[model samples]
Target: ASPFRLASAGEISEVQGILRTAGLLGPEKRIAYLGVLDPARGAGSEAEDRRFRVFIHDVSGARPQEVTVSVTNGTVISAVELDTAATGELPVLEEEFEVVEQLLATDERWLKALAARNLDVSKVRVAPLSAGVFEYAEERGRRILRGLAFVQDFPEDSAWAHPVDGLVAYVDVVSKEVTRVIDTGVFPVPAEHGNYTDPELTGPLRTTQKPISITQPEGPSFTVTGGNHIEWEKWSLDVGFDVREGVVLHNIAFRDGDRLRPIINRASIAEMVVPYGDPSPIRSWQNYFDTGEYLVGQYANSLELGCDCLGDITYLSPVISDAFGNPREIRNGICMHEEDWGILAKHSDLWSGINYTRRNRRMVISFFTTIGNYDYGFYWYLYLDGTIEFEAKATGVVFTSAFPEGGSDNISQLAPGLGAPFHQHIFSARLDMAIDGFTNRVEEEDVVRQTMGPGNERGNAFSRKRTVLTRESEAVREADARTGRTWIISNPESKNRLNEPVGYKLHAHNQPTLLADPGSSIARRAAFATKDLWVTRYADDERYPTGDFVNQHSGGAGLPSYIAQDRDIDGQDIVVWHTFGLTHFPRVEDWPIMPVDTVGFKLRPEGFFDRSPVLDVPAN
Candidate 1:
């Protein structure tokens, strides 16, 4: 069977060597990423057919230049210089900037300053500056490289905030030289040492329960076909990995009797935005496009079998490309396992005195990705009751901005000197819902209070109003818990025995809508987040909500741009985009590491199945 697989490590090396032999990688040229280019439909016959898109940064000139090389079948097919400013598609290779930081740490002046402060140069941690770090640069003509520093190797009892206080280093990208250092007044580092395991730091430590393990004696009721294709009873999907969207599940289908019905063609986290409310020069431009600015998939944590996932787990090794584009297995990058989810359904017969219950079982596929100070876990759940859930859990150290000597109550303190400010995290999932087939219609089902008419004497009566969205312009919807609003992707031609259109009901729980101003830079860029649901006519190339190239994007090619045409959407192949997030106001409880903040959406079967698909599921 023909399938798309990640390019092999041998292929990456061959492409790099080919580029080198062709004089593409000179002394001044460096590789940013070696991205896999999947085979286009009908373009190849072999299963292993693939191509590499190599992003090279040319630093020999006054300003940096971007070059893209297309290599296939061990040959350089095309080489072109792309306009970096126009494209805004530069790869954020943290390792490349780490090399610059390492060189800067060895500089005589840089080391001497550390010596004066009685700090060891070797114990200092350096991090690449964020996108807008160059906004404060004096010289715009030269290519500027910047990084932030934090003191490392402190005692275990003390927390290492990795605080980027007053020190900022500027280096030339081409020369790799620390040309200038900016030293503002240093903020006092919070003394937050002490192990959470044993000792106490601020006397607010609270210890809880011991470890409990969930086990499955008979093992998970799932099968892995080849390595990436997964099948669990009625649900099946092909899992693919990307440097941005870690675990992408495609071609998802559900078994309706003997036929495998397509529900979602593709599903993945399209993009994420973390917008900070602080107006400081450093924090004001803190709106981050996590997947666009940083490769989240590259930061996927290698999960342990028993600890990270319970019961019998199926571990899938994801083939990930490194900063230099070398292919390697991210061991246990994605995990699949079956979990007991309390009760599925319970019924009682009044006359027969029979009580019946069936236990709930679900197959969960999950992966975790760390973006700097935050770790995000994504889970795709398939339930026996024909329910699909997309959940995102956030954990990791808080990105605390330090304050000057005297601080006031106006700022929220996560710890003594660490100010944990307010921030918003918005995540969008691109779901191509193909409900029994590809052609589907999106409709809003809202429970509206009926007017007190002649037919009704009471004013408390409510009615269900189903509105079919006929065009892309009418597909924008918001979640209203009060009105019980839900969106459905239904096949107009398919009807169940009850004469209801077969579909899935999409709803969100514990999810916060985006609060960023509509005209703000962040809101303009992440237009998908402005609404809870957005439906558009399916376009194969439009896979991301914030567009494919969003590193330093100008917000012209994302969801807003796609719907500008307002094309007809009814009875067409449609893609549904859902936005969910958390409006975090940090507290002291979220200091060293924050607890998991979860937000998710549910897709429950509505008239899609004639009866409970798991009716025959045996009791445990």
Candidate 2:
């Protein structure tokens, strides 16, 4: 048993004990995250380093540190303060949520501001949100969370229904004090009680819908061994969970006859940002680096069978740390199941030869996280025909603000006075691709036409053109639906029957990047969201697109810094970072609890297999 396996509960305890003994864990400094260290990405056994990483946040001092401990040798390896100049700040602790809660509860200035606005503290719920990189005087050189007040008519009322806008309170979590309260022009609080759950509020449940049950009496066609290794159909991978990224698939491969072909070595939703599009000062600094500011996997929703997942589910729990550095397991944190994808291939031989049709099922590994108001489902799907897909499903309550005097297009007036702001849920998926082998190169394929040239007799001569991205600088690219843009990560050493390099083509979701202005606070922190793709040399430590400390990041790190070296990417171990998601303009139908607005990208086998692999399906 190697340390590369998922972090065990006992192993987490040993790491915590070492942290405490090393004076890294105390009353002031506490454990933010404790998990197995990342793979070193070396030849064979060189990568298996049997180590664990710990993030220690100084709650009272506002300084964060990173430490590594060895599980194989039982020794503390490294302890140093995180370079905030490059990585920003470490993730804010869950305990810090309570610290701001207590600070804003009894702050004299905040209380008096509420009194002036004729607001009641009991009914008012103040949200302790990470204030993005803003050049505010009070927040400078200090760890703080901006408190936004929302009014709830009753105890069970929806907190987002009524936004007490204009007054923003900056609370220093380290000192547990309210530094400043920005009292802009007072606005009226919407008295809407948006409780769509109660029968009295939303009438009754729908009776027209019938029960659609999915059953597998014969049990699921999936196997799990050694806890994390998963095998389904032709697909095999290690399903590992992290405190930052929920479900990370490692060493993904497909069994092609007697040979197991390697595709991506590691894949995960590295980071995500939700940036609002309102110009008002009250909502201007609303860009949220959801994964970086708030630990997504640490706050994972404990999934339930027949609810979170259907069919025969295989559940796995990930080991994490509580605020006090104790080991905790999130029960059913990850779910694996099978899904029937309508059809794989179908054709009718009209000439009277034979009609053929085939259906395909996908292995779905997913985990859901409810980070404050929004819930996102990170799903990784593997098809029997050698296709990999990452679908991010966003559903939950939208961030609400009061309707402005002159209604703006940036907001959807849900209720009479309740408005939902426009925002983008931009996500970055890190694919540490091995393709057929580790030394891979990326090619940008674009379909172009020669305008009435010698080759184009009818001016309809169009063909796909590929440009080799030989360096990191040449790898930063954007998605163009006009050219049918696709990136192919190919292994030059491995060739298919077509005599071409075995590769996987990436179909990027064409959507808007960060809409914020270039010099804006959000644009600075969420620099990774400015483009569609970034191909860089594989480095184990560069796991996230948004650097290690993106909580209050000032930007220019992560993908930007990762590519600064501009190393040769041609025929080298490479990792592709794809940024894709939805720019949400809330519809009236999305009120109350919004339905799932799914966004995803695809990785289809491009010459990785000889031909259509599904031809062997039994023709029943």
Candidate 3:
């Protein structure tokens, strides 16, 4: 008996019928190119290069009814379906699917019934981001090209409508009706953003500076290294305390050298240089104005770093304030990428900038990790004179958490923990606050929390109710052997609560960065270390804690130079505004990708001004 097996005669007939419908096989060329995607593998070698096989079937042949088809190496692995032969038969079930989807979408009149039964619907409004005309097809029904269709969200709901529930997109082809509903709506938005304005500093002229230059490490030629490297070339520029009006403007931008294109060569420079979303290179800078942190602002900031990581972030130490209420530290941003992780204070500092001696001190930190393997590379930088100068470093390792390795069916939910249910990957991030001397904080005393993800449906910070700040968690570390890279510590309580939509949030040397995010919390801002201008300059017999908003107040005092320098730094503006964005992995087609991804933020010069200030340069 030959190992080259073919479908039974009846099965062959069914496949042929499907092929005819799918337009894959004509009456002539016969049936060809059929095979399984990759060979079966044992559990131990799941990460090996998976393979797929193709074969040719015969509608009418002289000898063998079927011939084995094989192709290997340069095949693109994407979200692709089998041949149309297999998909063609899907139309037969189209009517059934349409009805089911309609029922699921409409809850089979459940909402109407609930309303009839006097159930409250006031809390519900149409889901914000889910509406609009989207291309739809039942089992890839529309065609190789999908047709445009309309989608309506469930009743009385915003972005975070349902928590811990997958929002299934259902459409009834026969009825031409589509609905987007989620069983639950609970997810969270991470901190650090590029919206509104950069965090602030108060008092007399407090300052520091740093200088950096990029020279990609000599290595394999462009082809061998994939010609995409931004790990070490990214830079973040900032302007502290407006000298003219005592306002501080935090800006972010990519250093796009004519010779380097981040899309094709993602790693050619530092990760920050990559464009936002998948195309444009617009930097999204956030702002702060007489208020607490902005939820959306934090979302944007974290998103920018995550985008640089291709949405596979490992850990980050954002710039934050110190106990002295100055924007001077870099502790506080720890394993933010890992879900339900714990604090490794033995090697980390959650409570930095608490000591009085640590006044006027700020540091910048950026961490990085590659795909698949473990061991995170901690890149620390001190922001001085408009630059993020390199500083000391630490590492984070990826290990198992308390929960069962694979809990949630959602791949994104199962990341950075035990046996992640989805395909595992790595995330890396870096910070470059090259404005004044890096005054972000890094201390010995601090606290750590956990983060969990069911999914990010509504983009809300508190998507889940239980996620509210509560008692300590119960996550434990994995066995030594399973541990690999620098991830957060694990907590069992947080892991078990994965079903609840809360996990972990790590804080390293978190300092106020120059990304201009307005949504940062006073507590969050004060976590880093900053300059102590108040004491050294006046010594008015008064002092304050780190998280003080007055430091960022501007105007009466504590303003950097107001003289704007609009020179040409290699064709680009000397003072550039940078924003944050998001990203996923890239395939071949995404090649020659746009300068950046889909990420954005804004700035308000007036937030720190006493009156309207005019700008000489163009504001993008």
Candidate achieving the largest lDDT:
2
Task: List TM-score per model, in order.
Answer: 0.87, 0.96, 0.19
Regarding TM-score, does 2 or 3 come out ahead? 2
Q: Please identify model 3 stretches exceeding 4 Å from their true place.
A: 1-110, 120-122, 126-176, 179-620
Sorting all predicted structures by TM-score, with the top scorer first, yields 2, 1, 3
Residue-wise lDDT of candidate 3 within 247-286, one digit each (tens)? Answer: 1222332233332211100010111211111110000111
Models, CA RMSD each: 3.9, 1.8, 27.8
lDDT against the true structure, per candidate, is 0.73, 0.84, 0.22
| Native-referenced Cα lDDT, model 2 | 0.84
Clashes of each: 6, 0, 148
Task: Assess the local accuracy of residue 298 in candidate 3 as a C-alpha lDDT between 0 and 100.
Answer: 15
lDDT of 3 at 476: 11
Cα lDDT tens digits, model 1, 1-620, are 33545445666677767777887777666666556654443423565546666667665652333334454556667776665455554556665567766887778867765666666777777666444323444433334545666666554432346465556676665566777766655566555542345444447555787787777677767887766788887888887778777778887898778899889988889888888786655445567778776768878999997778877888877775554445677888888888878988899999999999889888889999887678999999988888899889999877666755576332467666777658888888889888988779988888978788787777777789889999988888888888888888899989888888898999877367777677776776677878898888887567788876566555666788788879989988889998999889887777676889888888999889888788788866
Q: In candidate 3, residue 191 scores what lDDT?
A: 16
Q: Give the poorly placed runs of model 1, Cα more than 4 Å off.
A: 5-31, 34-54, 59-80, 99-124, 133-146, 153-186, 194-213, 403-410
